[PDB]
Amino acid sequence: KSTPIGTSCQGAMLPSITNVINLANQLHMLTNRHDKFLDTLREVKTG
Amino acid sequence: LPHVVSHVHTPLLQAAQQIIELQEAAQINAGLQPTNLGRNNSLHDMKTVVKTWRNRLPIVSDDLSHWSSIFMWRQHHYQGKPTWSGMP
Amino acid sequence: DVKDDYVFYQKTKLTILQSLGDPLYYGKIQPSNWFIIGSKTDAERVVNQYQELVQNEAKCPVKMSHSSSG
Amino acid sequence: SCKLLLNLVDCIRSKSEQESGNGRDVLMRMLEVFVLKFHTIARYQLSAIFQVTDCRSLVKTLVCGVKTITWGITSNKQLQPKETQIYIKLVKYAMQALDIYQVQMKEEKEVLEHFAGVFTMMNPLTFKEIFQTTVPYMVERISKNYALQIVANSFLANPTTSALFATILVEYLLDRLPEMGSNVELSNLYLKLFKLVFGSVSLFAAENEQMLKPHLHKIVNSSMELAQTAKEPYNYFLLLRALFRSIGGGSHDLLYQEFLPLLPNLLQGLNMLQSGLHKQHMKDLFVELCLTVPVRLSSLLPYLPMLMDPLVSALNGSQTLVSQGLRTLELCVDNLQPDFLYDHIQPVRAELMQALWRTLRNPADSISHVAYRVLGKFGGSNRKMLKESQKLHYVVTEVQGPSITVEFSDCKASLQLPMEKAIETALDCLKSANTEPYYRRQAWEVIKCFLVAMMSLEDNKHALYQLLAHPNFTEKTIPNVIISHRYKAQDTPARKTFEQALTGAFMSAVIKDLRPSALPFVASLIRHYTMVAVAQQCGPFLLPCYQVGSQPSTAMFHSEENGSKGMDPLVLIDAIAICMAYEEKELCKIGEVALAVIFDVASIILGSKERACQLPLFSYIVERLCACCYEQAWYAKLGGVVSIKFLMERLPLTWVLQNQQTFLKALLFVMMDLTGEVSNGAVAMAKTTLEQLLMRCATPLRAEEIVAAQEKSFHHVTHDLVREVTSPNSTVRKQAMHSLQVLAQVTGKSVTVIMEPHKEVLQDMVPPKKHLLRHQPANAQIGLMEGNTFCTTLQPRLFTMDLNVVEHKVFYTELLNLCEAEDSALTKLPCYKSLPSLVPLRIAALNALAACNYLPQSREKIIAALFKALNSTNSELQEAGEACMRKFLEGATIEVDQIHTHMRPLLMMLGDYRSLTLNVVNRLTSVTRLFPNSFNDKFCDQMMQHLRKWMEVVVITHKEEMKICSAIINLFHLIPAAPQTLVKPLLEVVMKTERAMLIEAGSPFREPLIKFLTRH
């Protein structure tokens, strides 16, 4: 009950934003809001 | 029984006809009572029962054992009518 | 052309009509609607069923009268 | 004071019977004071508001006095009209007085009982006169005061009132019957009055069966044809059930013989309504209306097969419908010689036998026992070989669904458990009706944790900033890539499950007690879905399927053999389409918010709104949203219309011009598939959206590209709009004609200029080419006739028609040969067989005769045909004949000799008694409306003798007819140059009739007379 949830089905995984790199003002505030949202969304466990 | 209908469900549906006929034939003895004999209650209902038994018929795919069971049971009440008219 | 009428407190009639041109029967119950009827054998089955139904839940009349025209 | 006057009335009565004096004026003098007392306490009570107790005591005391004074007067005799006006003022003021009881039972019902019984012992002739005049005021008072139902149901304790007041009540309701379905509380209250009046006829079988015998077709028929195009037709179907329980099971005699000629067209209608996918409880209502008909087993054999489809539906889950379905089936099994029944049950034998087999497992002793008895009644027909075998469950593919890796503390082993069924169960729980919110939160947690854990978490604050700040985002042009679902091969077993999870998240974000904890979460995910999508299909980091020259091929989607490298961000649009296509319209608000959020994110990180419109994602959005308008359901079409409206009003105009043709086609298919029963008000919204689209796109302006795009879209749109000019469907044809008028109104151009470059479409369509008017169905015949009428109605004439040049003789003579055969006996044709009316077919040809009036070489035939229609017997046919006569009135001239020779029969039957019927009077007043010079003073003098004869007959036959004498006087209003010396004699006989009948309150001989009187 203290480990992050992982899935072994990488074929159904939704790719990240950076995944396109390996396959080769308001903007700054929007980035901060998403970074904060991802920070609090990382702490999801299987408990 | 299994959800789908197959040969295993035949005996229950095959014996359902004779189960209600036992209740239907239970009124034969009530209508033959001498207290209420000869009235229209024991005359119109008797004809309806006879006509109802004459109409319905099972399918020929059934075994001859069930055909006999229905017919001799019907014959038992059919032969009971001359028993009280024989002693206008 | 075969026109057969049937007379049965209430008074409802059954009519059988056949138009010239095709052997297809038609029916109408009068207490421009038309009924679809097949061959001759289907005609009496409807008539016998209709006669049986009307004979039961009246109980005041007892009779049977019919005629033909054509 | 009223208490003392309560017992003082008998003293006046006792002294009045001793000697013949004057006591009638005294008794009516206080009555007017009491009437004025009602006004004083009712007018000032609104501004005034112990008080309440005193007010109700005064009302109760005065009402008892009113009942007492009426008791001594009546205890009949005919009442003078003057005091009937006082009673009109009394009843009008009494309703306003009955308002103190609202702010504060047992005594409330008692006092209303005394008030309702005042008019029971009154003269029935004057009783119906006052209530008919003041029937709309009483209905309006009920709309504001809900306590009048106590008075309403007290009208049937045991009076003779319900036998007469109900006739006026039903006539008023039938007059405003089409009003039902628009409002909410007005329709329900009208339905409540229908239930109460149907309760009275059902409870009292005497002198109520005769009242319901006439005007019964309108209740049965007009309810059906008005529920097709309405907003809430649920009230119409609630009214038909009440009638069924009253026309049968109780009052049965002359009502059974009247409902028989309606079963053909009614039973064949309910069969079509129950085959739809409208709602869940609506279908249960349809199968209840189709079954339990107030008709015995006889006179039902020809229509027996039409009661089998509802029987199957009633035996498919509903608790009450299965019990009723078994009862209906048992009644047929009882006395039907089941060999006859087996013949008519064969088409639905497989479905019915399976339904009966499955109804033996429910935990109920009142259903399984009945079903087992019914099955035992069949001889051997319950086990015969079924031609269709039972359906089986199979798995199409062999793959692995989503799983969660859970590790243990023993032997270092991980476990992967599937949760494909868990998401489906969570969706069912969120879609359930009676579930506690605790399990809803748990179901929402399952969706939330699965959705978060499925996606990856990377690029924290470093890679996201570099990608968004990279160049070639606002400079490089976006390549034109079209994304379509037409190339989709097959839905993978995982895509459907992931789609269901998204729909649950959207549905959980709108339900209350979970909305505040889900809106930021859902909105943030949608932002994440868009940013990952735009990072994949952009310029600098385009995938090989997103090249300048690319294809919409299967590699775009996530599939087995040709995938998109795993879970492309394209399922969000699919979830939006499904939620907008839900049976509940509460998901449209969140649907448009999500669309606004998607565009808001794209417009920020791209620089401009017009550049975001070129991004390939919006190409898939419109195709997905316009595909919801092709489903057979009506709620799905509404979701597409809302999506069309939102994308039209928000996203700029330059985008709309490119996709205007696609939007027009989607908005046009909705009005075509919905013909029999349309919707709960969907085509009205579709017409408004189409009208708004035309005004926005055709609005004149200013760059060269916008003008070129506007005219390019104009050419493509107008080409499609001339295609349905001769369409067989009347709904699209009328919309297309109205489409052209509004299009020319917005722009600074005429109508014919628009249709100049597209004449080649209509050259060989609006005229008959290689076809005849007898080999085609009447649906196409009407459309072609209306097309010619619209083609030759503008003052600029297109497709000029001249007889003896080319092919204009066969078409002309065909429509002349249509206005001769009247009865259906002479028109016994295979094509003209299913035409119950045949009236609208003659109307379209009749309008064509009046449309062409520029050919003077042949006018005798058209004039004779026009006068033949005016001399017809039908009312609707004659009214339209007057309409085209008025349309033809703008011709060159109408000679008097033509009129004299065409109205010869009317003068021939003028000198007869049994010839001046309603139809003839309607014909006579119609022909005198136009050409206001056809008669003289001698004809007026003769008509004065006729009305004297008419008014002498009524006064004898009284102790239908009221309308004809009201119409004959109304004819004098239309005719000009009537003699001035006839005014006195006509008003003298009117008073004589008003003195013999003793009626003064709004006589039918008053409304046309006052208009007739004011000329001189």
Swiss-Prot record, chain B:
It is found in: Nucleus. This is Transformation/transcription domain-associated protein. It comes from the Eukaryota. The chain holds residues 2922 to 3025 of 3859 of the full protein. The gene is TRRAP. It is linked to Developmental delay with or without dysmorphic facies and autism: An autosomal dominant neurodevelopmental disorder apparent from infancy or early childhood. Some patients present with intellectual disability and renal, cardiac, genitourinary systems, as well as structural brain abnormalities. In some cases, the phenotype is less severe, has no systemic involvement and is characterized by autism spectrum disorder and/or intellectual disability, sometimes associated with epilepsy. Affected individuals manifest variable dysmorphic features. Belongs to the PI3/PI4-kinase family. TRA1 subfamily. The PI3K/PI4K domain is required for the recruitment of HAT complexes, and the MYC-dependent transactivation. Although it is strongly related to the PI3/PI4-kinase family, it lacks the typical motifs that constitute the catalytic site of PI3/PI4-kinase proteins, and lacks such activity. Interacts with MYC, E2F1 and E2F4 transcription factors. Interacts directly with p53/TP53. Interacts with GCN5L2. Component of various HAT complexes. Component of the PCAF complex, at least composed of TADA2L/ADA2, SUPT3H, TADA3L/ADA3, TAF5L/PAF65-beta, TAF6L/PAF65-alpha, TAF10/TAFII30, TAF12/TAFII20, TAF9/TAFII31 and TRRAP. Component of the TFTC-HAT complex, at least composed of TAF5L, TAF6L, TADA3L, SUPT3H/SPT3, TAF2/TAFII150, TAF4/TAFII135, TAF5/TAFII100, GCN5L2/GCN5, TAF10 and TRRAP. Adapter protein, which is found in various multiprotein chromatin complexes with histone acetyltransferase activity (HAT), which gives a specific tag for epigenetic transcription activation. Component of the NuA4 histone acetyltransferase complex which is responsible for acetylation of nucleosomal histones H4 and H2A. Plays a central role in MYC transcription activation, and also participates in cell transformation by MYC. Required for p53/TP53-, E2F1- and E2F4-mediated transcription activation.
Swiss-Prot record, chain C:
Highly expressed in testis, moderately in brain and pituitary gland. Expressed in several fetal tissues, including lung, brain, thymus and kidney. Expression is down-regulated in malignant prostate tissues. Transmembrane segments: none annotated. It is found in: Nucleus. Required for MAP kinase p38 (MAPK11, MAPK12, MAPK13 and/or MAPK14) activation during gastrulation. Required for down-regulation of E-cadherin during gastrulation by regulating E-cadherin protein level downstream from NCK-interacting kinase (NIK) and independently of the regulation of transcription by FGF signaling and Snail. Required for starvation-induced ATG9A trafficking during autophagy. Interacts with MAPK14. Interacts with ATG9A. Belongs to the SPT20 family. This is Transcription factor SPT20 homolog. It comes from Homo sapiens (Human). The lineage of its organism: Eukaryota, Metazoa, Chordata, Craniata, Vertebrata.
